[PDB]
Amino acid sequence: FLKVKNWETDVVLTDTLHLKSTLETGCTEHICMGSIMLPSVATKDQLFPLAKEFLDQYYSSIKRFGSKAHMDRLEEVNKEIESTSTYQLKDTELIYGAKHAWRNASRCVGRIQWSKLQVFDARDCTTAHGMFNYICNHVKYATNKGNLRSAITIFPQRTDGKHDFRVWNSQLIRYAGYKQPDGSTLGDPANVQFTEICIQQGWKAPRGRFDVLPLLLQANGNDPELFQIPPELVLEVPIRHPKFDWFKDLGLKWYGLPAVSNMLLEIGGLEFSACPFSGWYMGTEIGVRDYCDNSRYNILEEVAKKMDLDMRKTSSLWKDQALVEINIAVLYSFQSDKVTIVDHHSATESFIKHMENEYRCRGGCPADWVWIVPPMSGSITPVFHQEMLNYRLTPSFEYQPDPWNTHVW
Ligand code: HEM
Ligand SMILES: N=C(Nc1ccc(CCNCc2cccc(NC(=N)c3ccoc3)c2)cc1)c1ccoc1
Ligand SMILES: C[C@H](O)[C@H](O)[C@H]1CNc2nc(N)[nH]c(=O)c2N1
Ligand SMILES: OC[C@@H](O)[C@H](O)[C@@H](O)CO
Ligand SMILES: [Zn+2]
Numbered sequence: 001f002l003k004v005k006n007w008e009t010d011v012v013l014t015d016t017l018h019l020k021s022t023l024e025t026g027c028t029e030h031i032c033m034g035s036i037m038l039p040s041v042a043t044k045d046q047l048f049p050l051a052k053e054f055l056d057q058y059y060s061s062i063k064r065f066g067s068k069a070h071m072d073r074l075e076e077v078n079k080e081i082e083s084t085s086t087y088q089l090k091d092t093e094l095i096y097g098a099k100h101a102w103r104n105a106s107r108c109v110g111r112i113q114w115s116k117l118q119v120f121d122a123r124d125c126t127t128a129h130g131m132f133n134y135i136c137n138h139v140k141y142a143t144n145k146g147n148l149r150s151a152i153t154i155f156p157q158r159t160d161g162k163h164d165f166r167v168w169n170s171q172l173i174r175y176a177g178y179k180q181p182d183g184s185t186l187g188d189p190a191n192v193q194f195t196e197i198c199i200q201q202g203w204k205a206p207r208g209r210f211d212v213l214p215l216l217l218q219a220n221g222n223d224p225e226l227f228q229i230p231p232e233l234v235l236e237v238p239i240r241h242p243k244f245d246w247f248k249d250l251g252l253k254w255y256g257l258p259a260v261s262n263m264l265l266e267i268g269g270l271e272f273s274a275c276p277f278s279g280w281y282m283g284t285e286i287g288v289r290d291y292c293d294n295s296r297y298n299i300l301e302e303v304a305k306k307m308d309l310d311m312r313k314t315s316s317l318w319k320d321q322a323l324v325e326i327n328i329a330v331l332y333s334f335q336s337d338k339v340t341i342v343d344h345h346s347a348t349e350s351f352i353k354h355m356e357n358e359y360r361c362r363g364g365c366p367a368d369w370v371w372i373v374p375p376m377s378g379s380i381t382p383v384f385h386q387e388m389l390n391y392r393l394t395p396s397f398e399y400q401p402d403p404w405n406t407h408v409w
Contacts, residue, residue, distance in 0.1 A: 008385035017364025023392035050269025097267030101395035107371035112354035118151040128225035148340035155274035165274035167261035168216035176211040287327035344374035348381040
C-alpha cells in the first residue's frame with residue numbers, strides 16, 4: 001500500500017494497483033535501473049493463466065465477474081487452448097485488451113484518452129497488400145482532415161513465430177534518412193538503415209530532407225513488400241513562426257500523424273507483432289527531440305544563427321533560447337492549420353488529472369517519470385513535482401526486435 005506525493009501541491013495518492021502487477025522492472029532492492037532505455041514461441045501451460053487473468057478482469061470491468069457467461073468463456077478458452085494450443089479473442093475482448101494496453105503504458109503521458117480509441121480488427125488479413133489496405137484506411141480515419149482521432153489496427157497474432165505479421169517501418173509515416181559521400185546525413189539520421197533497407201528492396205528515393213518513406217509490410221512471415229502511401233493521405237504541416245518571418249525560409253515541415261508500428265501488443269498471453277497505433281503529437285517530440293537531438297535533425301545551429309545569438313559560449317544559453325522558439329513554431333503551425341496537437345504544459349497537466357482518476361477509480365497509475373517529464377522546461381510542468389510508481393501491468397505494449405535482425409529471409 002504505497003504512497004506517491006506531489007511536491008508542488010502536497011496532494012497524496014495511495015497506490016494499491018501495483019499489487020496486481022506481474023512482470024519484472026529490472027530494478028532490485030539494491031539497484032535502480034529506472035533510466036535504462038530498453039528493459040530486458042510459447043507453450044499452452046503458460047497460456048491459460050494469462051487468458052484466465054485477462055478474462056477475469058474483462059468480465060469484471062463490465063460488471064459480470066465470475067458468473068455464467070464468465071464461466072462459459074473461461075471453459076470455452078480453456079478448451080480451445082487444449083485443442084489448438086492458442087485461442088481467439090472476441091471483438092469486445094480485443095477492444096478491451098487494446099485500450100488497456102494503452103492504459104497500462106507507463107511511458108505515455110497522453111493516457112487521459114485511453115478509452116477513446118478506435119480499434120480496427122485486421123485479424124482476417126493474409127497478404128502485404130491487405131496490410132497496405134488496412135494501413136491506408138487507418139491513416140485516413142485517424143487523420144480525419146487534421147482533427148486527429150486515436151486508432152489501432154491489429155493484425156493476426158503470432159502463432160508458430162515463423163509466420164509473423166510485421167510492419168518493418170518504425171512509424172507508418174516517417175521521413176527518410178540518407179548518408180552522403182562526405183559523411184554528413186540528409187533527412188532524418190534516425191532512419192538511415194531502414195531507408196537503405198527500402199532502397200535495397202528497390203525503392204526509388206527522391207533524396208530530400210522530408211521524403212515520406214514507403215511502407216515495408218511483412219505478412220504471414222513472407223518477405224516484406226514495398227507500398228507508397230497515397231500522398232493525399234499524408235497530412236503535413238509546414239513550420240512557420242508567429243514572429244520570425246525568416247522561420248519559413250528554414251523550410252521545415254512535419255507530418256501530422258504519429259503512428260507507431262514496430263511495437264508488440266500483448267492481450268491475454270497472445271502476441272500481436274503488427275499493431276500500428278496512432279494518436280497526436282505533443283509539441284516537444286517534434287520541436288525538441290526530432291528537430292534538436294544531435295543524432296536527429298539538429299537544427300539549433302541553424303536557428304540561433306538566424307536569431308543572431310552569441311554562440312561562442314555555452315553559458316549564453318543560445319541553445320535554450322532557440323529551443324523555445326522552435327517549439328513556439330511547431331505549436332503555432334499545427335494549430336493554425338487545424339491539426340490536433342498538444343503542448344507539454346497542457347499534456348502534463350492533463351496527465352496529473354489522469355493520475356487522479358486512475359487512483360480514484362482504479363487504485364493507481366503506472367508511470368515512468370524518466371519518460372513522462374517533457375524534454376524541455378521539466379520543472380515548470382506539474383509532472384516534474386509528481387512522484388510516480390512504475391510497474392508493469394498487462395495487457396501491454398512491448399518492445400520487439402527489428403524484423404530484419406531476425407527474419408529468416
Ligand atoms: C492520444 C494522444 C497521445 C499522446 C499526446 C501521446 C503522447 C506520448 C508521448 C510524448 C510519448 C513519449 C514518446 C517518446 O518520447 O518516444 C508516448 C509514449 C507512448 N505512447 Fe502515447 N500518446 C498518445 C497516444 C497513444 C496511443 C493511442 C497509444 C497506444 C494505443 C500510445 C501508447 C504509447 C506507448 C506504448 C508509449 C511508450 C513507447 C515507448 O516506450 O517507446 N500512446 N506517448
Ligand atoms: N532504438 C533506438 N532508440 C530508440 C528511440 C526511440 C524509441 C521509442 C520511440 N517511440 C516512438 C513513439 C512511441 C509512442 C508514441 C510516440 N509519439 C506519439 N505522440 C504517438 C504515437 C502514436 O500515438 C501517440 C512516439 C526506442 C528506441 C536506437 C538504436 C540506436 O540508436 C538509437
Ligand atoms: C537514458 C534515458 O533513459 C533515455 O535518454 C530516455 C530519457 N527519457 C525519455 N523520455 C521520453 N519521453 N522519450 C525518450 O526517448 C527518452 N529517452
Ligand atoms: O516522437 C518521438 C521522436 O521521434 C523522438 O523522441 C525519437 O524517439 C528520437 O529522438
Ligand atoms: Zn528503480
